[PDB]
Design a protein around this ligand. Sequence first.
Ligand code: ZN
Ligand code: ZN
Lengths: 4, 4, 135, 135
Amino acid sequence: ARTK
Amino acid sequence: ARTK
Amino acid sequence: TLPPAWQPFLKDHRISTFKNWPFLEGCACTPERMAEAGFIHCPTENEPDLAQCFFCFKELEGWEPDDDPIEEHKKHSSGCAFLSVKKQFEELTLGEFLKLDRERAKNKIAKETNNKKKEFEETAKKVRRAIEQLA
Amino acid sequence: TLPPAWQPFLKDHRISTFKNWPFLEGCACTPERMAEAGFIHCPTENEPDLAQCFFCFKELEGWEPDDDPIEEHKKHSSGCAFLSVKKQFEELTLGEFLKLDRERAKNKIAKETNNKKKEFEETAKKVRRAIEQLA
Ligand SMILES: [Zn+2]
Ligand SMILES: [Zn+2]
């Protein structure tokens, strides 16, 4: 998962 | 005290 | 921020409802003591010293300086689940709280039911009496 | 029922947030596992997979079917106090809860403040560039  |  | 329908669960909120409460220092039924007992000040005209348990909704008037609000509470509404609450409030479990809050809602409902019955019997008397007047 | 600005606090509401959501049975990052980790699904066109911790407000997209929502959450917001909550919601004390709700609203504030800063800074470059072009 990736930080917006 | 007393009831209403 | 605490939600509204539940501030009444807060002692300092309940205290805060006391406005022109005549029984201050020296007295046994001080606003502090009334609140610890569960009472809320809800004065009217006919009854300027009306108090109500927030939990079981019983109302008591004719307050006198020496009255201990706990003992009056026990005396006039001994079923009140609130009187079993030994622990503070912030030492209560969300489960225990929601339990209590649910009882409050039953109680509330029970009380409105009782009110509605009394109003209905009142109306009945009027009609009864009105029909005799015509007999 | 339960104050409608406090439901993000209970798992079911968090699950109930998951409307579409790819990744189900067979995957590690199911609704249940996202919601157990604190996530809320807050979907849009540009990104219909965005998850937000209800507590710290970290927004995380680009979910992979084998991402562990918890590890994914520790390794992106070590701060989150929610990660430390190891009791059921009902088993929380009103103090513990009111304490948690304090830190939450704070986070909400710090998040909105970090955002205002950036918009401000961005505005400040455009103004500075412009007066520079004039130079
Ligand atoms: Zn009572
Ligand atoms: Zn978080």
